[PDB]
């Protein structure tokens, strides 16, 4: 229900998105975000339907509202869980079967390791073929990804890669 909206001409209030976004239904919110310092503001609009946001993205991509031309996307959402001054790794290419007590079992052994979790598609529940491991010591989340580096995990090479520096 979320589109991302870029490219946006700074003097573009939340007034102006919606006479243009209202093109594709009724909006449940509307929020800019406004560049502290940048050329361009984006902002995220919501609608109730699905089918709305497309209405709007299909008709409103790729054209000048004032100044700049507007790029429209679905915009990717998650949630996640975190811990204060932890390293994270991102971890990729993972098995649909994998699910966060699997990934634990691979990544457990290694010192400082904390927590590891598989992104989930948030309505059918199935795998998004990725996740991430969390440990309390950058040396020793780095040691951990040289050493799974390609690794095979259930048939599949481990693709790893820090997830904050």
């Known amino acids: 229900r979320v589109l991302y909206v870029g490219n946006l001409d700074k003097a573009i209030t939340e007034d102006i998105l919606?006479?243009?976004?209202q093109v594709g239904g009724?909006?449940?919110?509307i929020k800019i975000m406004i560049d502290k310092n940048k050329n361009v503001n984006?902002?995220?609009?919501?609608?109730?339907?699905?089918?709305?946001?497309?209405?709007?993205l299909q008709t409103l991509n790729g054209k000048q509202i004032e100044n700049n031309i507007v790029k429209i996307n679905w915009?990717?959402?998650?949630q996640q869980s975190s811990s204060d001054d932890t390293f994270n790794l991102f971890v990729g290419d993972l098995?649909?079967?994998?699910?966060?007590?699997?990934?634990?079992?691979?990544?457990?052994?290694?010192?400082?390791?904390?927590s590891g979790h598989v992104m989930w598609?948030?309505?059918?529940?199935?795998?998004?073929?990725?996740?991430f491991v969390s440990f309390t010591s950058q040396?020793?989340?780095?040691?951990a990804m040289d050493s799974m580096q390609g690794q095979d995990?259930?048939?599949?090479?481990?693709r790893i890669n820090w997830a904050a520096k």
């Open 153 to 158: 995990l259930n048939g599949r090479p481990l």
């Open 18 to 21: 919606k006479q243009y976004f």
């Open 121 to 131: 598609d948030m309505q059918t529940g199935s795998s998004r073929g990725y996740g």
């Open 42 to 56: 984006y902002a995220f609009v919501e609608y109730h339907q699905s089918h709305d946001a497309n209405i709007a």
């Open 26 to 29: 009724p909006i449940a919110n």
């Open 139 to 143: 040396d020793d989340a780095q040691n």
């Open 75 to 78: 915009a990717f959402q998650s």
């Open 95 to 114: 098995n649909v079967n994998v699910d966060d007590e699997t990934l634990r079992n691979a990544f457990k052994d290694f010192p400082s390791y904390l």
